[PDB]
Amino acid sequence: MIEPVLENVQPNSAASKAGLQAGDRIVKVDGQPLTQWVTFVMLVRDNPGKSLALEIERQGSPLSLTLIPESKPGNGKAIGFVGAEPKVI
Amino acid sequence: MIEPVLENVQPNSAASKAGLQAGDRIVKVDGQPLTQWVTFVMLVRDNPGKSLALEIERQGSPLSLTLIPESKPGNGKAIGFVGAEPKVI
């Protein structure tokens, strides 16, 4: 139900470094289409330090960006984080 | 599908101030039961600067905490943020 559309981008995060912005919609990761935030988050979690090739939509137009999921300060889990919050209905 | 269980808590956020920790499960907000992260996030979004009464579960035991959703630096939308990321399957 949560839409793959960014509400907020955190500073010095994978998302800011990738050039993501509030309002951006995640459309494809590594060529694979997605429609749910959880799909995107699962991929991010599973891929710390791996380049994900993103196709996003901004203002109805496509952009190709690279996102590399990172750890978070204070978190020692072997997972990647986005650095952004999603929009909710 | 995303579980109302925290994977990470951000510093100087509503969640850290509330005393929330990774692994905590959100069980009730203002007496109302929830089972999905989106339900919790909707409430947070809708309630900037309003005290939400949280019942959480940590290690299988209930705790009562207060959470006051806040804005994020650089975001001028009239909404509240949690200050945390959820666990995903």
Swiss-Prot record, chains A, B:
Subcellular compartments: Cell inner membrane
Top-level taxon of origin: Bacteria
Effect of G23Q: Cuts RseA without previous DegS cleavage
Disulfide links within the chain: none
Gene disruption phenotype: Essential. Depletion experiments lead to cessation of growth, elongated cells and limited lysis, as well as decreased amounts of sigma-E. Not essential in an rseA deletion strain, when sigma-E is overexpressed or in ompA-ompC deletion strain. In the latter has severely decreased growth at 20 degrees Celsius. Accumulation of an RseA proteolysis intermediate.
Residue intervals of the PDZ domain: 2-89
Entry's induction text: Part of the sigma-E regulon. Also has a primary sigma-70 factor promoter.
Subunit-level organization: Interacts with RseA; the third transmembrane domain can be cross-linked to the transmembrane domain of RseA.
Function comment: A site-2 regulated intramembrane protease (S2P) that cleaves the peptide bond between 'Ala-108' and 'Cys-109' in the transmembrane region of RseA. Part of a regulated intramembrane proteolysis (RIP) cascade. Acts on DegS-cleaved RseA to release the cytoplasmic domain of RseA, residue 'Val-148' of RseA may be required for this. This provides the cell with sigma-E (RpoE) activity through the proteolysis of RseA.
Note: Regulated intramembrane proteolysis (RIP) occurs when an extracytoplasmic signal triggers a concerted proteolytic cascade to transmit information and elicit cellular responses. A membrane-spanning regulatory substrate protein is first cut extracytoplasmically (site-1 protease, S1P), then within the membrane itself (site-2 protease, S2P, this enzyme), while cytoplasmic proteases finish degrading the regulatory protein, liberating the effector protein.
Similarity field: Belongs to the peptidase M50B family.
Entry remark concerning the domains of this protein: The 2 circularly premutated PDZ domains act to negatively regulate protease action on intact RseA; mutations in PDZ 1 (PDZ-N) have a more deleterious effect than similar mutations in PDZ 2 (PDZ-C). A 31 residue insertion in PDZ-C (between Val-41 and Met-42) domain inhibits protease activity, whereas deletion of residues 203-279 alleviates the PDZ-inhibition, allowing cleavage of intact RseA.
Name recorded for this polypeptide: Regulator of sigma-E protease RseP
Protein source organism: Escherichia coli (strain K12)
Residues of the full protein shown: 222 to 309 of 450
